[PDB]
Design a protein around this ligand. Sequence first.
Ligand SMILES: CCCCCCCCCCCCCCCCCC(=O)OC[C@H](COP(=O)(O)OC[C@H](N)C(=O)O)OC(=O)CCCCCCCCCCCCCCCCC
Ligand SMILES: CCCCCCCCCCCCCCCCCC(=O)OC[C@H](COP(=O)(O)OC[C@H](N)C(=O)O)OC(=O)CCCCCCCCCCCCCCCCC
Ligand SMILES: CCCCCCCCCCCCCCCCCC(=O)OC[C@H](COP(=O)(O)OC[C@H](N)C(=O)O)OC(=O)CCCCCCCCCCCCCCCCC
Ligand SMILES: CCOc1cc(CC(=O)N[C@@H](CC(C)C)c2ccccc2N2CCCCC2)ccc1C(=O)O
Ligand SMILES: Nc1ncnc2c1ncn2[C@@H]1O[C@H](COP(=O)(O)OP(=O)(O)OP(=O)(O)O)[C@@H](O)[C@H]1O
Ligand SMILES: Nc1ncnc2c1ncn2[C@@H]1O[C@H](COP(=O)(O)OP(=O)(O)OP(=O)(O)O)[C@@H](O)[C@H]1O
Ligand SMILES: [K+]
Lengths: 346, 96, 360, 331, 56, 148, 50
Amino acid sequence: WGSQSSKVHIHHSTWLHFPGHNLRWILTFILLFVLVCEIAEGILSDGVTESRHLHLYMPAGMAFMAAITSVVYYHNIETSNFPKLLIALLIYWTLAFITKTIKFVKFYDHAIGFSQLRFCLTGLLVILYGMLLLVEVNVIRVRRYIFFKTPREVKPPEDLQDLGVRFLQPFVNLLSKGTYWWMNAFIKTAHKKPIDLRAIAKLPIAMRALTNYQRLCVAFDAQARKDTQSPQGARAIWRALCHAFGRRLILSSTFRILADLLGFAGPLCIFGIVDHLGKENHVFQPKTQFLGVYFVSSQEFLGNAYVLAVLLFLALLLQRTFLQASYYVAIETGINLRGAIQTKIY
Amino acid sequence: LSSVLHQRAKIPWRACTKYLSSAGILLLSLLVFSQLLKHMVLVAIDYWLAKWTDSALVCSLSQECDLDQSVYAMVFTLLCSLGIVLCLVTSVTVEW
Amino acid sequence: MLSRKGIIPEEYVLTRLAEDPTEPRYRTRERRARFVSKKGNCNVAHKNIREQGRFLQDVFTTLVDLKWPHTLLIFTMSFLCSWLLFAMVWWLIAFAHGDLAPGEGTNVPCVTSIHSFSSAFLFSIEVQVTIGFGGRMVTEECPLAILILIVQNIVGLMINAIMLGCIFMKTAQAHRRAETLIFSKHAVITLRHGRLCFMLRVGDLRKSMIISATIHMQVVRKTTSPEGEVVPLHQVDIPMENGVGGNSIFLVAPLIIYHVIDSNSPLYDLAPSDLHHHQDLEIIVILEGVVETTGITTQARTSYLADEILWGQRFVPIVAEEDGRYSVDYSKFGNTVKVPTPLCTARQLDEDRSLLDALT
Amino acid sequence: ERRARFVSKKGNCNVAHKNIREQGRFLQDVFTTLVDLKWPHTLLIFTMSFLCSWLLFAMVWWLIAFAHGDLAPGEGTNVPCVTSIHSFSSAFLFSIEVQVTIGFGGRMVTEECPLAILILIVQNIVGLMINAIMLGCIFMKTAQAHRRAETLIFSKHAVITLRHGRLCFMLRVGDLRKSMIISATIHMQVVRKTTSPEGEVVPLHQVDIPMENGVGGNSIFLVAPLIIYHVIDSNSPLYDLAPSDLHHHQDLEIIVILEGVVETTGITTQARTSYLADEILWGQRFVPIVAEEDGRYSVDYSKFGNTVKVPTPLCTARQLDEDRSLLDALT
Amino acid sequence: SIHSFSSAFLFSIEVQVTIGFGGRMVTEECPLAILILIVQNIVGLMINAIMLGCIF
Amino acid sequence: TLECLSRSTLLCVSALTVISYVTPVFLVALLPLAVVCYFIQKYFRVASRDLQQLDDTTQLPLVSHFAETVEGLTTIRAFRYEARFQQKLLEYTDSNNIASLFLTAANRWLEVCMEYIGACVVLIAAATSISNSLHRELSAGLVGLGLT
Amino acid sequence: FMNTAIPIAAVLITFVGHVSFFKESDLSPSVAFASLSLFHILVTPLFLLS
Ligand SMILES: CCCCCCCCCCCCCCCCCC(=O)OC[C@H](COP(=O)(O)OC[C@H](N)C(=O)O)OC(=O)CCCCCCCCCCCCCCCCC
Ligand SMILES: CCCCCCCCCCCCCCCCCC(=O)OC[C@H](COP(=O)(O)OC[C@H](N)C(=O)O)OC(=O)CCCCCCCCCCCCCCCCC
Ligand SMILES: CCCCCCCCCCCCCCCCCC(=O)OC[C@H](COP(=O)(O)OC[C@H](N)C(=O)O)OC(=O)CCCCCCCCCCCCCCCCC
Ligand SMILES: CCOc1cc(CC(=O)N[C@@H](CC(C)C)c2ccccc2N2CCCCC2)ccc1C(=O)O
Ligand SMILES: Nc1ncnc2c1ncn2[C@@H]1O[C@H](COP(=O)(O)OP(=O)(O)OP(=O)(O)O)[C@@H](O)[C@H]1O
Ligand SMILES: Nc1ncnc2c1ncn2[C@@H]1O[C@H](COP(=O)(O)OP(=O)(O)OP(=O)(O)O)[C@@H](O)[C@H]1O
Ligand SMILES: [K+]
């Protein structure tokens, strides 16, 4: 952080995202959610009593910070091609996994049961750490740098290395794929000077009209080999486009559907938030107390106005990022279709 | 040349002359009044709906400051009718 | 939908020819990029570096390059992180030992006086900084405390030793001494002893001598070889016309440095009529010696573009012989006065000499 | 096997010494050996030095207490020389407190016995000496700049192309850091099993090679990558390298030695690389690299070592200079 | 054991020089003391490190 | 466009007015958020105007190229020159597609940032309304209007 | 006109129907405002699926 003020390498640097990059971010995101769930449960629990009971949420409160710092450390070690330094992250996951495995089993021995949310959250978070750990060793298997003698080092993507490539959306960290953070620097350029065909530059390999034309010709030839149809009907072209862009059209639909389903949670959250706020009934959150600690169950957790309002905020973030993710994928596929079809017509 | 600041004119004059020398006086004022009236109805319908589900949850002509009505249907249907009519008027004025 | 979304996907229309649009592109305001700035700090931006962690491998060298504010913050963070981490360890081991719940019982604490986490944090401070107040002792009870005490002492000594080394290399920094070496803002081309040369002035301001000074000089022009090569920035070395050829120089008073333009110079075909701003030429000067106090080698970098040159002018004499000793009047350091000079090139002057000298 | 390299491409050499009459100089340079050691090994010796010193004096403190007999239970009929020493582990903790200078003060040194006073003096002096020595070793290790040599980057393989008529052996060297290398220097040597007319045989004769500098010096100012070449004059041993004679088992190697004091730590560093016989591409000029952007330059390290093919005669330098001279004389 | 100003000054000596006699400790009572202790330790170590370098 | 623009901006003003009325402590935090919103709108318009002109002036040569190629098809194929013109079309198509991609990405940049700002508004409105309805007894009706 | 009238007309019909022709609750804000927000999120794709 300090040195970047005195270096120019990262002005036009070149990245290499380690194997298992896409699912590494999503695992951090889902566990960043189920750590706010533990925070909400802890704050909900201790308030009914007359003391602090900091052990309910402070572990989660620092786990949330640890996860954020972990992803920042992982990204900083992903922009550079220096896998060695993530040994700390590798040992960290198992260090947390074993300790929280003990916590999970030591809830079962006392018959905590799934009826209490903290047991479900702990159990969910145990596998959320185990699978993250399994990703942290998958990087070892594919690069072979810690123990293996000869590393199988990999070069950065070939398209990134052109200085006439500046639309760097297809190769960037997942979170900035969603929030288009990389665009912010370009926006300052647009305000500083005008935007001619100089500021913007050549598009990546995947969007080049020749690449889309090649994929279209491959689709046509593969279709003509699988099915031997003498006419080339409108359905032939229709299946050609589907076979050339199915693995992206499905992604747009998947993102759009998930955005829609989470979007309806907004109205439903409004229903819950207002319904609980009736007659100013006295708080009766704890029903089954264990060893002097108040355990909050499922309905008790989602009956709290503050908990549901925070949950609504997280739901809006997911909805309004998936919806924009669907838009971009649809536009990218549509623009690729224009490129391939204009070339084919010519 | 240097026009980075100059480019951000925002075209405010290009709009003032447009409305003046093309629309006139009567219809421009009608458009603004109609738009504000319709939006105030939207404020009023939400405000009335809120106070209705509030008080009714067990001389009423006044839109506000009155809580002496067993049924709020009469004033709420009228507000809905005003919104529909003002939408029609607003659309006609803008397009004409 | 409030947005203007309707049935208009065709967008089929015919537009007449459009030419000469109003746009801020009449002239290129940006000038020729300087290869090194006038205060060193070369204005070259590396790009497309395939990073392999080499920047991060040498953390020690990286720490030295950091500014003092950021170095202090990292210094503070390093100590604070070690102090607080071992505070948790001491707190947790005492809490596991059970000597944290107070009472008049048979238990004897492993680390005395630990009552809350605050005392654990203060005990961590005492152990690693070796303050050793001694109200929170380490007893003989649990051997794990002795192990952790050994570990914390070793880690504290290592971090102290490492930061000492870094501070010793940062207090020996001489990047703030190289900034007291002064080059004249603009250099001149003027005749001396009948041969044209590219004069210049370099002076030292402080009283601490720089040992073993060495004035190199390079010309930076794009070069097209007869074989057709394309070198965007070729660097040709330049002599100093010293009495012994070597690059060494002894600098107390501001000396005049000049490159005698002989037959083997790359300045040999320059005319004042082609010394405008947009001329692709630049003269770099490298004054490197060893500072006598710190013993650390330093460089001073300056550049002279085409427009910075001043043809046919001579530097004003600066040194005088006062009562007690010599004087250096730095107010005249960069003043140039015009001298009667030809406008001919170096090769034109050589041709004139070739004929005029051979009278018979 | 195939062909031994004198220095590997990464800069480390491959020469293996044998039959050395070990005089103990390897052991004698204790401080230099520690600096060479890796940080894990340095930390192990660091830990073992302190732990051995702490435990050695801990046994002495236990021994003196046992000899004085003050560790057995007592009721006012005794004053221990080192307070609160009622176990060996107490003596071990006391040793830690003294040498590290933590000084908790629960186990004091009393005025009673003088032997503990002498041992306290010895332990303090030994602790200060070992602390000073480890400081020195750590200060020399934190001042190491061999990891700076890694940031110095050479071309994957070098070329030999015509420039300004004559023939030259070209090369490219680059620096990745933003820092500067003061007083840089590029040496260059050819290593060939060169036989002499007089009867001598040299297994690997190292012939120095000029850098074809403007002023005939070894100084180089390295900020951007530079096409550091060598003019193949008559005296250059590369005067008789046939392009047909570039195959694998051609006994050749081009050493390169990029020196120069690093500005940050003030330490001088070497960079090394060897171009083999088959690692030379005849007649392929380098790709221009230093582009220009708005108000600033731009180096494209993606095209650092790419070489495009340029036409040139496939003749030895002797067959070129002589032929050109004859043509000029005839004309 | 803070009684007069001289006690506070001697306590400052014990902290920065790291002598730490321990007759004037820092308890858990006021958190600001812990923060000031951290500040004095860091500042003392930084000044000591700088003077070491200059002496060297 | 005028109907949609006026209705959109006035709905926004009306919606913000109601949110402020329900929770008076919202507007205090609105002012820093309104400043951020002003910057986003300013920078986006400057970027969007440039990309819009670029998109227009890039799609004109493409249809012109198609028209002229159909005019002189025989002459082009006579020279066996069609490899050059296919490369010209690919550059024109790539230029057109990159202009569209940057315009869409600018649009998505604005939308993501504005909807995150709206999400922040929801959290501010929801938190302050629940607090004000547990102390000042907002009567739970303005809460519903504020949320929706 | 149709785009900006179908939400209000639907909301008008819905509220009047529940009060008069249904009488299945007391029309608490938890239900009234949740249904209002649902109508907004449903109007946007319903008017545009055509
Ligand atoms: C258990 C409780 C959890 C409750 C919440 C659950 C939320 C779960 C979210 C999980 C989503 C999982 C999807 C993962 C895959 C993403 C899409 C993906 O892989 O495509 C990536 C694409 C582009 O790929 P490409 O490199 O061009 O093609 C691949 C290759 N060429 C090939 O052969 O094919 O590029 C793109 O996909 C473009 C970017 C769109 C993606 C942006 C989404 C980011 C989300 C941001 C959320 C912000 C913060 C949320 C915090 C919430 C909790 C605190
Ligand atoms: C981030 C931690 C990573 C390491 C975690 C533990 C790993 C133990 C290693 C033991 C040896 C066994 C496997 C060897 C792994 C070597 C790792 C390593 O060298 O990287 C450490 C890094 C970078 O060095 P590099 O460029 O990779 O080194 C050359 C390399 N071998 C090569 O391929 O060419 O070196 C650096 O660039 C500096 C790293 C210093 C890290 C210090 C962190 C701050 C600690 C402060 C708090 C102290 C905590 C004390 C806890 C005590 C608890 C009892
Ligand atoms: C263009 C910049 C972009 C932004 C990047 C940096 C951001 C900095 C913000 C700017 C304002 C900084 C004001 C800091 C004031 C306090 C620090 C202080 O006095 O040191 C300031 C100076 C160094 O200044 P410099 O100009 O950077 O140094 C010149 C040289 N060329 C160089 O940069 O190198 O220091 C010295 O000259 C060295 C003296 C050291 C003595 C200090 C002893 C005590 C230090 C404090 C320790 C206690 C900290 C307490 C923390 C408690 C945490 C719980
Ligand atoms: C250049 C076209 O590239 C885009 C393409 C899109 C995709 C898209 O939905 N379009 C229409 C929808 C259909 C009926 C035309 C639309 C336009 C305006 C407002 C909202 C909407 N829909 C929003 C979601 C629910 C249905 C109504 C978005 C944005 C862009 C963009 O300029 O960045
Ligand atoms: N194998 C070897 N290893 C280390 N040093 C050697 C070796 N062979 C010779 N030397 C060193 O070379 C020098 C003399 O070499 P030379 O073999 O010619 O004579 P020498 O008979 O070994 O000499 P001396 O009697 O001095 O040991 C001495 O400094 C000796 O230490
Ligand atoms: N962009 C770059 N950043 C850093 N080092 C680079 C870069 N490009 C090349 N190098 C370095 O230059 C040398 C070879 O460069 P070149 O690109 O010509 O070959 P290469 O195929 O990368 O070589 P190798 O297989 O040895 O890595 C290597 O030491 C390599 O690390
Ligand atoms: K001490």
